Write a protein that binds this ligand. Sequence first.
Ligand SMILES: *C/C=C(\C)c1ccc(-c2ccc(N3CCC3)cc2)s1
Ligand SMILES: *C/C=C(\C)c1ccc(-c2ccc(N3CCC3)cc2)s1
Lengths: 133, 133, 133
Amino acid sequence: TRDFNGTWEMESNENFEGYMKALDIDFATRKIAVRLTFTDVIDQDGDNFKTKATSTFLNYDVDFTVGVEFDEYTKSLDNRHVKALVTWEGDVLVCVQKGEKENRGWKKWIEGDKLYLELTCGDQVCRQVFKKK
Amino acid sequence: TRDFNGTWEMESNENFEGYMKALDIDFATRKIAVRLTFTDVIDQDGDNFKTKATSTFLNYDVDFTVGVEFDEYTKSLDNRHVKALVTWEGDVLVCVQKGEKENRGWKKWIEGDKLYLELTCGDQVCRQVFKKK
Amino acid sequence: TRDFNGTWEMESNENFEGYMKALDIDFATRKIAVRLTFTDVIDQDGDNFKTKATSTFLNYDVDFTVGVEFDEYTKSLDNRHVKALVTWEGDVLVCVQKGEKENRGWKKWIEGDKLYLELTCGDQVCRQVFKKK
Ligand SMILES: *C/C=C(\C)c1ccc(-c2ccc(N3CCC3)cc2)s1
Ligand SMILES: *C/C=C(\C)c1ccc(-c2ccc(N3CCC3)cc2)s1
């Protein structure tokens, strides 16, 4: 068909870096641009096209069942493969991500009406606190 | 007027990078900051101001008519001028971007509820697929 | 509790830089990621979880009273110390930030119902226009 009207949300993006290299894009811009997805709005009249590309910093999705191991590729992080397992420890949700990196995983728990999140890798621990919106 | 109250959506931003360079902001940060737009919410009571600046990625717009060449400045890319032509090859939308870089352009086509996009420049090809939203 | 259901708005984020370095994330990416906040949406039915982390740019706040000097450590910028003063010059709001950089400040004014903002540092000017939304 020749009908390009619609709102189009990117689902895959292959060799974006090489293309950018051909245009003489600097390292920093390339290293950010590779972490984006795009939604593109095409408004087409006959042979008149108006198009708008929208850019966004690419979400981190992850689905799991507690105690069910699952493969995880950490796109938009460090692009690694890990074998993740989430367990209950009391009321703490604990995830170990087995792979190249040592001590890798995270912890989630509720205290009060705040969500606590510990991100761990190696000897580094990142602490995050969330309030319900 | 002395009333700045409102929600203010950026319309243009010139020499943002030169201003940032004068402040000694590192190259990486500036290359990001130039791809943002800003909405500034101003709450002004008398001489008391509270302001909040919001950041978003710019966007990339482009209008054309099939078979009507048009000069194109590729902002937020490699910032070049090209004489672009979007033409039909069957039901594939074909774009040639004449300029310093050559074999530069793209091919777009619909199959099912997917839009396919090949970006080519030099010997590099980038493949992107979009789902209709 | 074991009920993680909700939409969770980040309130604090400690040692995010160290964690990312432990993951070998490139310098450019780390300088961006430190300017983001996250909203984590958790959909949990028993031990089944779906989670989506969304990224958004940290807002940049500044409150002031015209004619009252105040010290400023420039946060999302170049982290220098400045003595800031906002004064009226007719209906042009004028701000001087005294410090190492010379001619550092900005000018903001409404003409029509667009907002004009001139940012200055040294001999460099950045001109920005906003429309009221
Ligand atoms: C149909 C033609 C399309 C979708 C495009 C041609 C070039 C595009 C583009 C838009 C934005 C970006 N980046 C944001 C920073 C780099 C790269 C390429 S879309
Ligand atoms: C339940 C949510 C969890 C465990 C999260 C784990 C890692 C997250 C994340 C998302 C993005 C980034 N950045 C991009 C570079 C840094 C780091 C960590 S959420």
